[PDB]
Amino acid sequence: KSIFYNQVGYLISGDKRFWIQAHEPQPFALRTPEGQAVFAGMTKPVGGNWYVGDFTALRVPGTYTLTVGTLEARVVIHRRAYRDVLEAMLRFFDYQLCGVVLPEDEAGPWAHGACHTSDAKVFGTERALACPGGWHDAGDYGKYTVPAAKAVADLLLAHEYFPAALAHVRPMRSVHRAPHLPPALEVAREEIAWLLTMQDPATGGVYHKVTTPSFPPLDTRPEDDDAPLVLSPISYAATATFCAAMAHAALVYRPFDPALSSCCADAARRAYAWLGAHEMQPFHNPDGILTGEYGDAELRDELLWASCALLRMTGDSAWARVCEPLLDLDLPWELGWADVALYGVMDYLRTPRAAVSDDVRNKVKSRLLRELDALAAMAESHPFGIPMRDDDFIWGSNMVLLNRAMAFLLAEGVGVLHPAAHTVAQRAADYLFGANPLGQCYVTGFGQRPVRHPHHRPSVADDVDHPVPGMVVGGPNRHLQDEIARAQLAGRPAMEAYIDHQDSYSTNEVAVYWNSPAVFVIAALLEA
């Protein structure tokens, strides 16, 4: 038996909760490290077989010993408890940089020379094309347009919403250009710059991904990976998500990098022209390409996002003719990577009210509220207070969770203020940092039970026991979609369907689009 808690820490002014498996209320105490009790209370039932202890009213910063029954845990309370972990989570993006020297003074053990520097060949042609830069998507070295757009969107949103919190962190500053932009925008620019090179100049269409034809060994260092790079065909989804992301970037970078902003604005417009002239064809891996497909049969949510993004970028009411009918569809309103309608909803809602139909706008806001109410209900019935059900624990469940937390916080910027918003955010972070049935901190390098063996090639290649820090893992996946999970996790409840093993890619991989909602949510909490 043990105490389950936020292993990174708690905010002075934030909610403070711990969990234990018990069958009745027990007293508990928080004590200074010399041992004197500073706070005492009683645990209370929350379902399954869980009790919780609330020590929110302890406001004095320090490292305390939580004791309950015969168990003890070490809990930290601090003004900005999540500053280190947010910085690590943002630095992950720079650790993923492709085609750039990462020096040892910035990147420590994981420093390396520029990787994947060769030109990629366009699929089914002899043509070559340079598209250097950007991020290795995940545990592999491929760069995929569709998930890249979500990661960029999320970082841009975190800058718009929580610039003060983000001002307190430092990326790998010396690998980026001077004069230095604010942290989120500095980091995001490297991906935006890469995305721009994935657009076909002749048509406006965007290539779906650039990868080697297959995955290299788990042991491969990035600079050792010398297989030819292949540009997979142009896709509707890539072109639409590129459009939306570039349109978002055009607005955000206006006062920071006017050349980039103007360049993104025009690229978004050329992408949208491509969408207008082409069919909504789902992407499938071409033959001889075995890397991540990032396919998606439903493409109207991507068009929605592209259209709403351009609406807000231009402020032209003309775009609302095409947006508002897409906003009426029964699409799921989610934050990607495949179901991206809520990004579009947010662009629509953050457009000047004069540019849109007031009728439609209030209906959109009403639906957003009903959605949040539904998520809030899930959270009430869950023992750890997270907006999740057992069936939500799929591949990348940590992202499912963080996107839901993100939705509550995004809504507060568009006049939909749900009372559960900040509780949900705190519970999400608590869960991510150890307040779960496995007592598992799902970020590398933090907490008392960190992730130690992520499915991540740079980590596997150097030290298989000490990985790159600040990486958020996929989390429990009840579908057991790799050999290690099938072997070791059959019959376990959904939230326990995780294993810290380097070969469990379906529960223990990492991704730029899993760090990006975590950056947003943790930034929100830091803005205390």
Ligand X SMILES: OC[C@H]1O[C@@H](O[C@H]2[C@H](O)[C@@H](O)[C@H](O[C@H]3[C@H](O)[C@@H](O)[C@H](O[C@H]4[C@H](O)[C@@H](O)[C@@H](O)O[C@@H]4CO)O[C@@H]3CO)O[C@@H]2CO)[C@H](O)[C@@H](O)[C@@H]1O
Ligand Y SMILES: OC[C@H]1O[C@@H](O)[C@H](O)[C@@H](O)[C@@H]1O
Under rule CB under 5 A, residue 84 binds Ca ion: no
Which residue, 14 or 396, is less far from ligand X as judged by CB? Answer: 396
Residue 115 binding partner per list ligand Y, ligand X, Zn ion, none, with a CB distance cut-off of 5 to 8 Å that depends on partner kind: Zn ion
- Bridge partners of 5, per DSSP, are 18
Helix (H, G, I), strand (E, B) or coil at 510: strand
Tell me the C-alpha to C-alpha distance, in Å, between residue 440 and each of 216, 231, 435, 474.
29, 38, 7, 12
Report the distance separating Cα 406 and Cα 400, nearest Å.
Answer: 10
3-state secondary structure of 362: helix
Nearest residue (CB) to ligand Y, 25 versus 217: 217
Of 298-337, binders to ligand X (CB under 6 A) are: none
Among 283, 505, 514, 520, binds ligand Y (CB under 6 A): 505
Please state the closest distance from residue 245 (CB atom) to ligand X, in A: 18
Residues of this chain that bind Zn ion (CB under 5 A): 98, 115-116, 222
Q: How far is the CB of 285 from ligand Y (least distance, A)?
A: 11
Provide the phi-psi class of 206: left if phi over 0, else alpha when psi is between -120 and 50, else beta. Answer: beta
Contacts with 65 (C-beta within 8 Å, 6 or more apart), sequence order: 30, 31, 32, 33, 35, 72, 73, 74, 75
Tell me the C-alpha to C-alpha distance, in Å, between residue 167 and each of 170, 184, 431, 525.
Answer: 8, 9, 25, 14
Residue sitting closest to Zn ion (CB): 98
Question: Mask of contacts with ligand Y, 136-175, x by CB under 6 A?
Answer: --xxx-----------------------------------
CB nearer to Zn ion: pick between 116 and 270: 116
DSSP assignments along 253-304, one per residue: TTTT-HHHHHHHHHHHHHHHHHHHHS--PPP-PPTT--S-----S--HHHHH
Catalytic residue among 248, 382, 455, 501: 455
Burial class (CB in 10 A: 0-12, 13-18, 19+), 276: exposed
Taking CB under 5 A as the criterion, the residue among 15, 257, 296, 371 binding Ca ion is 296
Closer of 216 and 439 to ligand X (Cβ): 216
Residues that bind ligand Y (rule: CB under 6 A) add up to a total of: 6
Least distance in Å: CB of 139 to ligand Y?
4
Q: Residues 433, 441: contact at Cβ < 8 Å? A: yes
Q: Judge contact between 446 and 407, C-beta under 8 A.
A: no
Unique residue bearing structure tokens 């790079």? 229
CB count in 10 Å sphere of residue 150: 26
E strands of 69-215, at which residues?
Answer: 71-78, 120-122, 128-129, 143-144, 209-211
* Residue 471 binds ligand X, judged by CB under 6 A: no
Q: Interface with ligand Y includes 5 (CB under 6 A)? A: no
Q: Does residue 292 belong to the site contacting ligand X (CB under 6 A)?
A: yes
Which of ligand X, Zn ion, Ca ion, none binds 116 (CB below 5-8 Å, type-dependent)? Zn ion
Is 472 within 8 Å of 96 (Cβ atoms)? no
Among this protein's residues, is 509 annotated catalytic? yes
Residue 13 marked as a ligand binder:
no
Examine the residue annotation and report whether 223 is marked as an active-site residue of this protein: no
Q: Is 293 a catalytic residue?
A: no
| Residue 377-396 contact track with ligand X, rule CB under 6 A, x = bound | -----------------xxx
Contacts of 388 (CB under 8 A, 6+ apart): 378, 382, 397, 400, 401, 404
If binding means CB under 6 A, how many residues of this protein chain bind ligand X?
A: 17
119-138: contacts with ligand Y (CB under 6 A): 138
Select from 430, 427, 439, 517 the least CA-distant residue to 472: 517
- The CA distance from 128 to 124, in Å, is 11
Q: Is the dihedral of CA 374, 375, 378, 379 positive or negative?
A: negative
Binds ligand Y (CB under 6 A): choice among 509, 515, 516, 526: 509
Report the residue number, 240 or 394, with the smaller CB distance to ligand X: 394
Query: What's the closest the beta carbon of residue 136 comes to Zn ion, in angstroms?
Result: 6
Site string for ligand X, 505-524 (x = CB under 6 A): x---x-x-------------
Amino acid, res. 41: G
Q: Binding site residues for Zn(2+), as ranges?
A: 98, 115-116, 136
Binding-site residue numbers for Ca(2+) are 296, 298, 301-302, 338, 459, 462, 464
The residues annotated with a catalytic role in the active site are: 455, 500, 509
Annotated binding site: 98, 115-116, 136, 296, 298, 301-302, 338, 459, 462, 464
Q: In the complex, which residues of this chain contact ligand X (CB under 6 A)?
A: 137-140, 142, 291-292, 338, 394-396, 474, 479, 481, 505, 509, 511
Residues that bind Ca ion (CB under 5 A): 296, 298, 301
